[PDB]
C-alpha cells in the first residue's frame, strides 16, 4: 500500500512539473548573436609534480593557487612569477581533493584515508604544520569546501555529506539520502545552500542551516562526475560519464538545454563557468577541454596536454583559467 | 635585470625547493608499488605482519629484499563497491590476491571476485600474483573426511591429478589442491590476449619465503614487459 502511494505521488510530481514548460530556451535564444570564436594561449606552465594531478583551487587574491598529486605533495604557486611559495608533504599518498581558504590562512586535503586535514600557513615559526584532523567518515573523501575559518563541508564515498566544526572537530549536521556514493559539491555565493551530485545519477539541493533535502533533480542515466553552480545563484550545471552535460534551474525545476556532440564518446571530469555566465568550461576525457556557449549549445572554442584533463578553475576576476592533467603539468590560459 | 632586492630571495627559495623536489624524485623512481586484495576470511593480516618482520582507509607496509624497496598498499575500511577508486591503481607493478581455500562455502564468491578483478578494463596490462593460503587446515579437514568436496563441487568426482603435479604428503589432498588451481587457472586463461599473467602459489599459514616469491615474480613480470617493448618476445 505504501509503494502505490509513493508511485502515485511521484507521478503527480512529474505531471505537475510537466504542466510548467511553455517555451524552450533555444527558441527564445535564437534572437541572440553568437559569441563567435574564442582564442586562448598558454601563458605559463608550472612544473614540479612527480605523479598525476587530481585537484587544484584558486586563491581569492587571484595570484596564489594550490594543487595536489599522487606522490603526496601540496605545492602553493605564485602564478605571475611562476615561483614556489610552499611545498607540504602529506602523511597519506592517495589524495583526491584540496581547498584553499577564503582568507588565505588555511588549506585542506583528503583522499583514500577517510580523514580531512587542516594546515596552518601563517605561524610564528617558519614551517607549515597540521592543525586538525577530522575523522568520522567511512568512505573515501571526494570533496571539501570552506565556509569560513571555522566551518567546512565534506563529501564522502559512504553516500553521506557532513558539516564540521573545526574548533572542536565534531560533526554538527549529517546529510543523508543519496543512494550511491557522492563525488562533487558546489556552494552558493550567499553560502546558504549547496548542491551535490552522486553516482545514482541524481543531484540534490540542501539547506545548510536546518539540514534536510529540498529538491531532487534527475535526467542523467549514468553517474555524475562534476557539478558547478551558476554565478546568479538560481541555476547549476552537471557533468556525467555520459559524455553529456546539462543545465538545471532551481525554480522551474526542469532540465534546460543540454550540451552534447556527436563526436564525443568519453565522459567529462570537470565543469566551470565564466564570470558573466556566458561561457561553460568543461574538461573532457580525450585529452581536451572544450568551450561551450551557455545559451546556444555551440562549441565556441577548444583548449588543446598529453593525458586526461582532471581539473579546472576560473579566477574570481575572470582574467585567467587553469587546467590540470595526468601528465603532471599545470597551464594558465587566457 | 629588473628584479628588486626582495625578488631575488624569492627565486633563491624557489630554487632550493626545486632541489629538494629533485632529490625526492630520484628517491621515488627506485621503488615498486603493490596492491593487496582479498576477503576478510583470507589471511591478509598474517602475511602483511610477517613480511614486515579507528576506521582508517588504507594501510601501508614496507619491506626490503636484496637492496630493493617495495610498497604494498592494503585497502581497509571501505564500502562494498570498488568500481570507483580502482582507477587510482592503474600504474602499480602487480596485484596480489589472497584466497582461503579451506571453506568450500564462500569459495564460489572468491571465483567471482577474481573474475571481476581479472576482467576489469582499468586493470588490464597488470599481472596478478595469486596466493592460496591456509593449506594445513585444508589437509586436516580433508583427511578427517567429515566434509566432502563433491557435496559442494560435484565435478570433483570425475577429476584426476595432472601429470605436471610435483608434490614435494598424500595421494589425495593433491587432487583437491590441483582442482582448486585448475578452477582459478581456467578462469584466468579464458582471455587476456598475452598482456598480463597469473602466478599461482601454495602459501601456508606461516612462511618465511613470501618476499622472495614476490621478488622473483616481479622480476619476471618486468623482464617480460621489457622484452615485449623491444620486440624480442
Amino acid at each position, epitope marked *: 500500500q505504501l509503494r502505490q502511494e509513493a508511485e502515485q505521488l511521484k507521478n503527480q510530481i512529474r505531471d505537475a512539473r510537466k504542466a510548467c514548460a511553455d517555451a524552450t530556451l533555444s527558441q527564445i535564444t535564437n534572437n541572440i548573436d553568437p559569441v563567435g570564436r574564442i582564442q586562448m594561449r598558454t601563458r605559463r606552465t608550472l612544473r614540479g609534480h612527480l605523479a598525476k594531478i587530481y585537484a587544484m583551487h584558486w586563491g581569492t587574491d587571484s*595570484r*596564489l593557487l594550490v594543487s595536489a598529486s599522487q606522490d603526496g605533495k601540496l605545492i602553493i604557486w*605564485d602564478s605571475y*612569477t611562476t*615561483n614556489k*611559495v610552499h611545498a607540504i608533504p602529506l602523511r597519506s599518498s592517495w589524495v583526491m581533493t584540496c581547498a584553499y581558504a577564503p582568507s588565505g590562512n588555511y588549506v585542506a586535503c583528503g583522499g583514500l584515508d577517510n580523514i580531512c586535514s587542516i594546515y596552518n600557513l601563517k605561524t*610564528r*615559526e*617558519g*614551517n607549515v604544520r597540521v592543525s586538525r584532523e577530522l575523522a568520522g567518515h567511512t568512505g573515501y573523501l571526494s570533496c571539501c569546501r570552506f565556509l569560513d575559518d571555522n566551518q567546512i563541508v565534506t563529501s564522502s564515498g559512504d553516500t553521506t555529506c557532513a558539516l564540521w566544526d573545526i574548533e572542536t572537530g565534531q560533526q554538527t549536521t549529517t546529510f543523508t539520502g543519496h543512494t550511491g556514493d557522492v563525488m562533487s559539491l558546489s556552494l552558493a555565493p550567499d553560502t546558504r545552500l549547496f548542491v551535490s551530485g552522486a553516482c545514482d545519477a541524481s543531484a540534490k539541493l540542501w539547506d545548510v542551516r536546518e539540514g534536510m533535502c529540498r529538491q531532487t533533480f534527475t535526467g542523467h542515466e549514468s553517474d555524475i562526475n562534476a557539478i558547478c553552480f551558476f554565478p546568479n545563484g538560481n541555476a547549476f550545471a552537471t557533468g556525467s560519464d555520459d559524455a553529456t552535460c546539462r543545465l538545471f534551474d532551481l525554480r522551474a525545476d526542469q532540465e534546460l538545454m543540454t550540451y552534447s556532440h556527436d563526436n564525443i564518446i568519453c565522459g567529462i571530469t570537470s565543469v566551470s563557468f565564466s564570470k558573466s555566465g556566458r561561457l561553460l568550461l568543461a574538461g573532457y576525457d580525450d585529452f581536451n577541454c572544450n568551450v561551450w556557449d551557455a545559451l546556444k549549445a555551440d562549441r565556441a572554442g577548444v583548449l588543446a596536454h598529453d593525458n586526461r584533463v582532471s581539473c579546472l578553475g576560473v579566477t574570481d576576476d575572470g582574467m585567467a583559467v587553469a587546467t590540470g592533467s595526468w601528465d603532471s603539468f599545470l597551464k594558465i590560459w587566457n | 635585470c*629588473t628584479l*628588486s*632586492a*626582495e*625578488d*631575488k*630571495a*624569492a627565486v*633563491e*627559495r624557489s630554487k*632550493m625547493i626545486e632541489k629538494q623536489l629533485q632529490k625526492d624524485k630520484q628517491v621515488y623512481r627506485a621503488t615498486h608499488r603493490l596492491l593487496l586484495l582479498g576477503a576478510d576470511n583470507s589471511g591478509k593480516s598474517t602475511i602483511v605482519k610477517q613480511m614486515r618482520i579507528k576506521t582508517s582507509g588504507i594501510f601501508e607496509t614496507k619491506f626490503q629484499v636484496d637492496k630493493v624497496n617495495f610498497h604494498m598498499f592494503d585497502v581497509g575500511a571501505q564500502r562494498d563497491e570498488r568500481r570507483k577508486w580502482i582507477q587510482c591503481f592503474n600504474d602499480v607493478t602487480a596485484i596480489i590476491f589472497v584466497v582461503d581455500s579451506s571453506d568450500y562455502n564462500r569459495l564460489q564468491e572468491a571465483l567471482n571476485d577474481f573474475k571481476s578483478i581479472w576482467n576489469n578494463r582499468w586493470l588490464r596490462t597488470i599481472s596478478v600474483i595469486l596466493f592460496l593460503n591456509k593449506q594445513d587446515l585444508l589437509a586436516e579437514k580433508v583427511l578427517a573426511g567429515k566434509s566432502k568436496i563433491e557435496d559442494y563441487f560435484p565435478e570433483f568426482a570425475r577429476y584426476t591429478t595432472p601429470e605436471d603435479a610435483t608434490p614435494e604428503e598424500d595421494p589425495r589432498v593433491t587432487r583437491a589442491k590441483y582442482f582448486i588451481r585448475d578452477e582459478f587457472l581456467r578462469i584466468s586463461t579464458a582471455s587476456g590476449d598475452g598482456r598480463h599473467y597469473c602466478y599461482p602459489h601454495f602459501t601456508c599459514s606461516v612462511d618465511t619465503e613470501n618476499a622472495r616469491r614476490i621478488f622473483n615474480d616481479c622480476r619476471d613480470i618486468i623482464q617480460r614487459m621489457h622484452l615485449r617493448q623491444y620486440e624480442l618476445l
Partner: single-chain antibody
Amino acid sequence: VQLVESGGSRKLSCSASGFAFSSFGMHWVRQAPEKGLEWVAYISSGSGTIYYADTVKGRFTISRDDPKNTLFLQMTYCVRSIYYYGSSPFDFWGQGTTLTVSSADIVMTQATSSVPVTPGESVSISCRSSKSLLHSNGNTYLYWFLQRPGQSPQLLIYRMSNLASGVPDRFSGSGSGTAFTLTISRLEAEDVGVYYCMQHLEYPLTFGAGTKLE
C-alpha cells in the same frame, strides 16, 4: 621565538632556539652609543649570497652553522628575515649586542628630531628619501620600527602600508613615492620612544636619523 646571544680580534655568536632557523636569512645591525641604527652584513638562507657594508668589507666575515643553530661574525643585533610573496621581513630582533668600532647609495633624512605630545591627541612623523622607492611591480619598500627606551626595536609597518601582526590598530602608513608620513590616532604611555625610517630597495639598508617623542 626567542634568540638570545652573548659574546664580546674577536668573534661574536648568535644562537637561535624556537623556530626553523634553516629557513630564515639573517642580518647584523649596529647601533652607536648616541647615534641611529646602521647595517653591517647579511647571509642568505642557503648560504648562497653574502653582502657586506661598504664601510668595512675586508675586516669582517659572517658564517652560519645550520645543524647547531648558531650564527657567527668574525672581527679581522641579530635579526630574522624571510622572503616570499606576502612575508614580513625584519619582524623579530635579538636581545642586543652593539658593535662599537673605533656615494651612490640612497640617503634619507627625517625632518625633525623631537616633539612634545599629549595623550589622546594624534601625532604625525615624516620621512623623506633622495630617490623614489616605488618599484615597477608596485611595492613601495618602506619600514617603521619604533625602538623603545631600554629594549630592542620592534616592527610597526612594512611596505609603507601593511600593519604588523601584534601591534595595535592605532598606527597607519601612507606616502607618495618620495615623502612619507606615519600617523598615530590615539596615544598611550607605551608609545614613548624613538622612531626610525628604513628602505629595502637596495643592499645598503640606510636607516634614518630618529624622532624622539617626549
